[PDB]
Structures are given as C-alpha cells and as structure tokens.
C-alpha cells in the first residue's frame, strides 16, 4: 500500500556563524556611485547577511 | 563397433533478483510540495508498482 518514513523533528544545521556581519550599506548608502559602463565591484564575503 | 558416453552442460536461466521500485521518494524525495505536485500527474507510480 505505502511506505514507512521517519518525519523530521529538529535541525542539526552544522556551520558556526561568522564573526562579522555583511556591510550591505557600502553599496547602498555610498556617498557616490559609478556609471553603467565602469561600475564599482565590492566583493562581500565571510560575513552574515540580512 | 564402439560407443562413447558423453556428458554435456546446458545452462538455462530461471529467474532474476526481484526489485521493488518506490516511485515517490525516488522521484520527489522527502519534499512534500513535490509529492503534492506529482499527485496531479495521475496513477503512474501505482501502475508501475
Ligand atoms: C571400445 O572403446 C573403449 C574405450 O573407449 C575400449 O576400452 C579400452 O580397452 C583397452 C583394452 O581392451 C583398455 O586398455 C582401456 O583401458 C579401455 N578404456 C577404458 C576407458 O576403459 C574398448 O576396448 C573398445 N572396444 C572395442 C571392441 O574396440
Ligand atoms: C555569532 O555567534 C556568537 C556566539 O558564538 C554571537 O555572540 C554573535 O553575536 C553571533 N553573531 C555574529 C557575529 O555573527
Ligand atoms: C545608510 O542608510 C542605511 C539605510 O537607511 C542606514 O541603516 C545607515 O545607517 C546609513 N548610513 C551608513 C553609513 O550606512
């Protein structure tokens, strides 16, 4: 008729959080912006985003 | 004027390893939404079972 399965109950996500947060305001609240042909690329890595 | 007794081997298969196919967890895994989407496809998995 059917199959036997074990339903999930709790989460064992295993990745400790990074010591700093992602500065998303650097590209959003910058004092000046670049043009479309020559933009500014800011690599955001090793952080926790919101 | 003479006779020879010969023994020969004949191999014929009888059956094979019976397999059961679980359609739901093979196609959609443990996802409930995928199972709900597959439920609109009809009775393919039941027919194959
Ligand atoms: C028919 O063939 C068999 C063997 O295929 C013969 O038997 C042999 O006979 C000789 C002497 O009589 C023995 O030294 C052998 O050891 C025998 N072989 C075996 C396997 O036992 C038999 O003699 C033949 N008969 C005729 C009338 O020729
Ligand atoms: C990360 O985890 C630590 C505790 O290990 C906590 O104090 C901190 O506020 C958390 N936030 C960060 C920095 O990602
Ligand atoms: C820029 O704007 C964001 C969103 O309003 C605000 O959170 C932030 O404090 C402002 N200033 C800087 C320096 O990011």
Swiss-Prot record, chain B:
Disulfide-bonded cysteines: 23-45, 28-34
Glycosylation sites: 2
Domain of life: Viruses
Protein's job: Precursor of the fusion protein processed in the biosynthesis of the S protein and the formation of virus particle. Mediates fusion of the virion and cellular membranes by functioning as a class I viral fusion protein. Contains two viral fusion peptides that are unmasked after cleavage. The S2/S2' cleavage occurs during virus entry at the cell membrane by host TMPRSS2 or during endocytosis by host CSTL.
Name listed for the protein in its UniProt record: Spike protein S2
């Amino acid at each position: 008729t059917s199959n036997f399965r074990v339903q999930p109950t709790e989460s064992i996500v295993r990745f400790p959080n990074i010591t700093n947060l992602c500065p998303f305001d650097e590209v959003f609240n910058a004092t000046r912006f670049a043009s479309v042909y020559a933009w500014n690329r800011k690599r955001i890595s090793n952080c926790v985003a919101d | 004027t003479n006779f020879t007794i010969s023994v020969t081997t004949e191999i014929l298969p009888v059956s094979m390893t019976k397999t059961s196919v679980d359609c739901t967890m093979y196609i959609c895994g443990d996802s409930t939404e995928c199972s709900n989407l597959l439920l609109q496809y009809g009775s393919f998995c039941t027919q194959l079972k």
